[PDB]
DNA sequence: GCCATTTTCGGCCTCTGTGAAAAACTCCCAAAGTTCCGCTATCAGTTAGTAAAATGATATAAATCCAAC
DNA sequence: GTTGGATTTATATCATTTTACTAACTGATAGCGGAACTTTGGGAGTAAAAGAGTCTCCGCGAAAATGGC
């Protein structure tokens, strides 16, 4: 999602700088979103909205 | 406090599968069981407990106390 | 040194809303715009699989300790 | 006083559950490019002859800095 970089990045560019695939960095971002989906993590968050 | 789902409880899937395994639902109901009683199940050893108990202690609410009149 | 024509100024706040004339067509050609369809890239959604790590459960070995003789 | 079985701790190995990392299918959706078509936009041309501008306005005064003689 492009923060604190001068650019955005596909899954290609995220799984050529890691030693990682397409799939394997889909599902680490399925779980962040997950992860930050939990309601004690994202009352601050909500005031935003 | 006491009336939160103990989804709202960020723990392993371990620990909420055994939790289930013992028919949790709410929190409260995890804190009237002791730690004997609770290392007592199928797959919830050691470092589970630990987890949970430093889960509670960040909720501030260590296994053990009891309450009035519930519900 | 003296007319004689230009140039330059003339208090602070507050509200306020403007549409109001004016008369050609015609033909040819090029480029932009609109729309449709096909290929390609990109991602969510889901399922199943395999190796490995993590964790718990059980096993195996002693410490010692407590009761009975 | 004692001592040996047992009733607990101590250390290690095994099984179960979960994590980390693959691929394949599904379904869509957006973006780009090309071909055709319709719209827009610029240019050239017109053969009774037609052959000198507005422009209403123009209810200001005192002083000073400028040419012209």
């Known amino acids: 999602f492009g923060i604190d970089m001068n650019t955005d990045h596909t899954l290609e560019e995220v799984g050529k700088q890691f ?16 992860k930050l989906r939990h309601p004690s993590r994202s009352e601050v968050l909500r005031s935003f909205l | 406090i006491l009336l939160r789902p103990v989804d709202d409880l960020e723990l392993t899937v371990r620990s909420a599968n055994c939790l289930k395994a013992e028919a949790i639902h709410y929190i409260g109901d995890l804190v009237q069981r002791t730690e004997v009683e ?15 108990k430093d889960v509670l202690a960040s909720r501030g609410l260590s296994l053990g106390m009891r309450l009035e009149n519930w519900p």
């Open chain 2, 38 to 52: 609770l290392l007592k199940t199928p797959n919830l050893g050691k470092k589970s407990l630990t987890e949970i």
């Open chain 1, 19 to 34: 030693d990682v695939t397409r799939e394997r960095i889909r599902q680490i971002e399925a779980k962040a979103l997950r």
